[PDB]
User: Fold Nitric oxide synthase, brain from Homo sapiens.
Amino acid sequence: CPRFLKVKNWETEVVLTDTLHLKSTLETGCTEYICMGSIMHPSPEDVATKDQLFPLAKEFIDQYYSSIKRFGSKAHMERLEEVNKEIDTTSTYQLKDTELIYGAKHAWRNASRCVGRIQWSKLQVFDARDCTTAHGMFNYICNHVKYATNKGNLRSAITIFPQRTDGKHDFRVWNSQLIRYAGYKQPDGSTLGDPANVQFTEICIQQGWKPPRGRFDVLPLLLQANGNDPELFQIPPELVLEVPIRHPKFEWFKDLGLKWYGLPAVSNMLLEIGGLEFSACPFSGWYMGTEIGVRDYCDNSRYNILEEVAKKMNLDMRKTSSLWKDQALVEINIAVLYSFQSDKVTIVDHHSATESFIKHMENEYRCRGGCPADWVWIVPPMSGSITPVFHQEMLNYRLTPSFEYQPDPWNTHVWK
Amino acid sequence: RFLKVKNWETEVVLTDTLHLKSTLETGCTEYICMGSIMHPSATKDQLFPLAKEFIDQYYSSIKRFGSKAHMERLEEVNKEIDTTSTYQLKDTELIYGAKHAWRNASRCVGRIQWSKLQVFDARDCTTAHGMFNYICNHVKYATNKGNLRSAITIFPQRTDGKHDFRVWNSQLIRYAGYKQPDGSTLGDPANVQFTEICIQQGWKPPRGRFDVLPLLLQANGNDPELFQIPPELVLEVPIRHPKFEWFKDLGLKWYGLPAVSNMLLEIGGLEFSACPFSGWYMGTEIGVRDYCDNSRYNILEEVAKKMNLDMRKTSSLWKDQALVEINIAVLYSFQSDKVTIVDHHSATESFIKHMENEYRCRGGCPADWVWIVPPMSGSITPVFHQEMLNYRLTPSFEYQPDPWNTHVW
Ligand code: HEM
Ligand code: HEM
Ligand SMILES: CCc1cc(CNC)cc(OCc2ccc3ccc(N)nc3c2)c1
Ligand SMILES: CCc1cc(CNC)cc(OCc2ccc3ccc(N)nc3c2)c1
Ligand SMILES: C[C@H](O)[C@H](O)[C@H]1CNc2nc(N)[nH]c(=O)c2N1
Ligand SMILES: C[C@H](O)[C@H](O)[C@H]1CNc2nc(N)[nH]c(=O)c2N1
Ligand SMILES: [Zn+2]
Assistant:
């Protein structure tokens, strides 16, 4: 690799130099002969060995004391030694509260696919490593939801449960997000609610959940503690902020009966810190409008409302080149933004978000020597080229600590 | 190893074997992806193997791989490189190579058309007057009174590098751009530099919003020369809107024929520094990028004003609304004037079908998601949800430096 990699913005001519890539840790999937930049997941029940864990821990510890300007200090060398003794006698080790907080914040700072990272340092970290039961997990998650929601003034947060040990005692949240709507396949092949969540719903129903079988039913939490069978809990409905979707100009838009929930809370990723694995680490921010307005609502295999909206807009839907789809899409996204703002629930539009991300990325290049970014994900799902990120060259690479994908728990769980 | 790509909307999974045949680098490494970098990073000795590879895949394409004809061709090519340090492509080879440069263009969403390409062989050309003749004929043929036909014109190959043929225009047809005293730009800001060179070389500029630039043509490494395309060969479309009657009062128009003239065609180790090619427009090329890029004609604000939209807050999505209307106008204008054009829904749709074709008949299809996905309405087109492998096959179209940066007068 070269020491200096340069990226250009083609709209502003601004050029930035990246050195942070030298710190890259794992593989991207690309080679010199092929690029897998548009593959969603470019790639066993066993855990890190002693010898594998030593250098990963030391790497993170080094980076931590380096961040607080105490590199090579007595406390640094002592912490190294303590960590080394712990690994050597227990095959694992425990993070200090400060190290945990630093690690969580940096996994977010390092998330190449996140357009919201200007916020990374303002993450509230809830330490749930004392948790031992699913009831306890439920307590922590509820407290998380209430804090994060803040009566609509959303605050970003992460709750972190005990790290993996032997891989047979994992903590998992089986939900893909803390709050999602149920999806139900009908005998006639149609889907009620959210087609994205049909499989998870069927699992909940199997596990005992009695479904309301409506259009927007909040799923229960399915929580696994210490590798035991997962348990169902209903989130107190008052903890679940929702926004009915209406439109500034089209009075009929409310008649569509759409709503969405305020808190986006991904709960199925793995947080890796210093070689330690936190398989349950629900985190939440707030929405960019297109997440709801374009993807959740207008994806074909989601709520797929474009046609019904375009019909009420009395658009000519017979030719594609009338751009009836594009026209309808804009009005839906206007509605989503308008309804959140009206209800004073935090949300950010794709223009503001991408403009803040360019400012963030620049600052990162200046103060950090780079900012990994996944263009394929950073560019919004509509209006791409009228946002500043479209024209921005980016380098993608993996820094640690990081959020990682992990397989769905029902696929691996040994049922007791 | 065999690689799979998945469409997350349809769950269709295709298997790539074709990438195994690439040899050119993409710019990525195992540790760092550069998929969003616009431009990443001969001798007798080097030339023959490149030639061999091309001849090999040519005779393979006509199911005569290892034939007496094939062997004699290799030998003929070896002898020729020996006695001349280069070689000449057969007419068949030229046409094959040009179609496959298009076929291999990872960033082109229009490649379902790849084998319908009219190839004009201009390798006998010697002077800029000759290039001008060939280019007028190309333009006339490709334009076809609005029923556009894909075409490429191939001028003589690079020899010593001191004698290149170059079309200095980035496209055969483009509008001039002018740096104004007050500081602003009249016409196309993308072409301000090129416009200045034409003016400096003697072109008398109308100084309008849509002045068609002259051809600036360089033959055999000599100073480039100026030519006016006969106006009757330049097909243009006034942009109007099917609902907004005031839209025509914006005085917008564009040309029908998109004809990229600054790329380099490489075939079997040979480099064709002048190879203007044309097809037809996808509406967003004009309606989104040409018209609404901040650094281009930049008309979003004017349109939104006429639509009387609230422009005080960005969350009103006034930009997004205006953008769709401009693109409705562009498609509607071309279609009313019967000038070939494709919308991004239909084009991306075709491209998915084309991928399936290619995976089936060829074992893959190199594709650059960053370029294939349209500059608006990404996820409501099928390509958004389509995983793509990008890799570099040859024959190819490559970037090359602008010749004023290189030329000695
Ligand atoms: C605070 C406001 C935030 C905004 C506006 C935001 C925005 C986004 C958006 C729009 C995406 C793409 C979503 C998609 O297309 O599915 C994303 C991805 C992501 N974000 Fe953020 N985010 C925020 C907070 C956070 C926080 C607090 C974390 C972690 C602590 C985080 C970590 C991630 C990760 C790991 C991804 C990629 C996940 C994947 O690859 O599937 N984000 N973000
Ligand atoms: C026939 C109808 C065609 C359509 C609808 C079409 C469409 C497109 C579009 C929309 C782009 C992106 C351009 C941009 O964003 O600036 C593109 C790129 C490209 N096309 Fe096609 N195209 C067509 C024909 C052709 C032909 C005839 C050739 C060559 C023989 C060709 C070769 C290329 C190449 C090399 C690029 C990428 C240029 C670069 O990397 O900068 N295309 N095409
Ligand atoms: C593969 C698992 C997956 C798929 C998808 C598909 N997106 C439509 C999204 C995934 O995560 C998406 C994500 C992650 C973190 C976020 C934080 C804040 C926010 N507003 N949105 C987020 C959205 C994960
Ligand atoms: C990187 C150099 C470059 C930049 C840009 C900027 N796009 C707005 C476009 C470039 O080529 C753009 C191109 C090439 C071939 C085409 C063939 C047919 C067609 N309709 N459009 C094309 C468009 C090259
Ligand atoms: C930075 C980025 O690579 C650059 O802006 C690209 C993005 N995608 C594109 N896609 C197309 N079709 N055409 C372009 O010019 C670009 N520009
Ligand atoms: C095939 C492609 O990688 C996939 O559809 C990606 C494209 N870009 C995306 N970008 C974001 N922000 N979110 C997504 O889910 C996706 N999906
Ligand atoms: Zn790559």
